[PDB]
Write an enzyme that holds these catalytic residues in place. Structure first.
Site, short mmCIF file in Angstrom:
data_model
loop_
_atom_site.label_atom_id
_atom_site.label_comp_id
_atom_site.label_asym_id
_atom_site.label_seq_id
_atom_site.Cartn_x
_atom_site.Cartn_y
_atom_site.Cartn_z
N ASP A 172 47.55 36.82 114.84
CA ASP A 172 47.51 37.02 113.39
C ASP A 172 46.24 36.44 112.78
OD1 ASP A 172 47.98 37.52 110.81
OD2 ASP A 172 49.95 36.54 110.70
N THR A 173 45.27 37.32 112.50
CA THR A 173 44.03 36.89 111.86
C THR A 173 44.23 36.46 110.42
OG1 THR A 173 43.48 39.18 111.21
CG2 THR A 173 42.70 38.39 113.35
N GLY A 174 45.39 36.76 109.82
CA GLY A 174 45.66 36.35 108.46
C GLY A 174 46.30 35.00 108.31
C1 NF7 Z 1 50.29 36.75 103.72
C2 NF7 Z 1 49.14 36.21 104.56
C3 NF7 Z 1 47.97 35.80 103.62
C4 NF7 Z 1 49.60 34.92 105.37
N1 NF7 Z 1 50.67 35.25 106.36
C5 NF7 Z 1 50.24 35.81 107.69
C6 NF7 Z 1 50.52 37.31 107.67
O1 NF7 Z 1 49.97 37.90 108.80
C7 NF7 Z 1 52.05 37.57 107.65
C8 NF7 Z 1 52.69 37.23 109.00
C9 NF7 Z 1 54.19 37.61 108.95
C10 NF7 Z 1 54.68 38.87 109.67
C11 NF7 Z 1 56.15 39.24 109.63
C12 NF7 Z 1 57.16 38.36 108.87
C13 NF7 Z 1 56.67 37.09 108.15
C14 NF7 Z 1 55.21 36.71 108.19
N2 NF7 Z 1 52.21 38.98 107.44
C15 NF7 Z 1 52.85 39.54 106.19
O2 NF7 Z 1 53.26 38.85 105.30
O3 NF7 Z 1 52.92 40.94 106.21
C16 NF7 Z 1 53.76 41.62 105.26
C17 NF7 Z 1 52.89 42.94 104.81
O4 NF7 Z 1 52.99 43.75 105.87
C18 NF7 Z 1 54.41 43.51 106.43
O5 NF7 Z 1 54.38 43.37 107.68
C19 NF7 Z 1 54.94 41.88 108.05
C20 NF7 Z 1 55.43 41.35 106.96
C21 NF7 Z 1 54.86 42.13 105.80
S1 NF7 Z 1 51.99 34.13 106.43
O6 NF7 Z 1 52.89 34.37 107.56
O7 NF7 Z 1 52.79 34.17 105.20
C22 NF7 Z 1 51.13 32.52 106.56
C23 NF7 Z 1 50.93 31.74 105.27
C24 NF7 Z 1 50.19 30.43 105.33
C25 NF7 Z 1 49.70 29.94 106.68
C26 NF7 Z 1 48.93 28.63 106.74
O8 NF7 Z 1 48.54 28.44 108.05
C27 NF7 Z 1 47.71 28.89 105.88
O9 NF7 Z 1 47.20 30.15 106.20
C28 NF7 Z 1 49.88 30.73 107.97
C29 NF7 Z 1 50.63 32.07 107.90
#
Ligand code: NF7
Lengths: 99, 99
Positions: free
Chosen positions: B25-27
């Site tokens: 996860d690059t995000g």
């Molecule tokens: C929102 C981003 C800026 C940040 N996130 C990473 C994302 O990749 C997150 C991963 C994810 C994938 C599935 C379920 C839950 C989470 N993807 C996500 O929300 O996707 C949404 C949109 O598309 C759909 O598909 C999947 C869900 C829907 S996070 O997990 O909240 C997070 C927050 C703070 C930290 C600290 O380390 C500081 O960064 C680290 C990680």
């Protein structure tokens, strides 16, 4: 380009004729942008993340340019913490992970 | 290898003597793993994304193997719906985004 990950992969995008900064997010299925005005029709939808679910407006078939590469796809608009570009558009610009 | 993004970039990891599936996860700045009973000291932390914040336990200097690539760094343990390999470890295994 090749993007290393010592820093957040933030790029400039163009959508609705406006420039914005967005995070290339391989962990997102979908693209979610902060509150903004976009032309055309939308539909209310829900999306879940790490902290729960939010209400978003779904815009389909939206033109969006990512770091100089064009995509046309779904864009969700709502209270996301940051503009994220998800796999629905990352695939369109030919983005892969490599190690 | 090269990983396309048609589907979620899930890979096998080894942590705390367990094999798990996790998103590259690059995000994510940090690595966030589903609840597991790791030994040692930890520090409380809160991380926020779509839907809000979750409470996690920060462990430092944890050994993780990602697709046969060894790394060591911080892992956050809490009620995340998915295991997330963030940039703090992606850099250590040589992962880049390419388009
Ligand atoms: C929102 C981003 C800026 C940040 N996130 C990473 C994302 O990749 C997150 C991963 C994810 C994938 C599935 C379920 C839950 C989470 N993807 C996500 O929300 O996707 C949404 C949109 O598309 C759909 O598909 C999947 C869900 C829907 S996070 O997990 O909240 C997070 C927050 C703070 C930290 C600290 O380390 C500081 O960064 C680290 C990680």
């Amino acid at each position: 380009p090749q993007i290393t990950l010592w820093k957040r992969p933030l790029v400039t995008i163009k959508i609705g004729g406006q420039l914005k900064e967005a995070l290339l997010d391989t962990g997102a299925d979908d693209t979610v942008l902060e509150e903004m005005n976009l032309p055309g029709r939308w539909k209310p939808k829900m999306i879940g993340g790490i902290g729960g679910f939010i209400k978003v407006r779904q815009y389909d078939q939206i033109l969006i340019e990512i770091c100089g590469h064009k995509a046309i796809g779904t864009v969700l608009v709502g209270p996301t913490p940051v503009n994220i570009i998800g796999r629905n558009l990352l695939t369109q610009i030919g983005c892969t992970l490599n190690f």
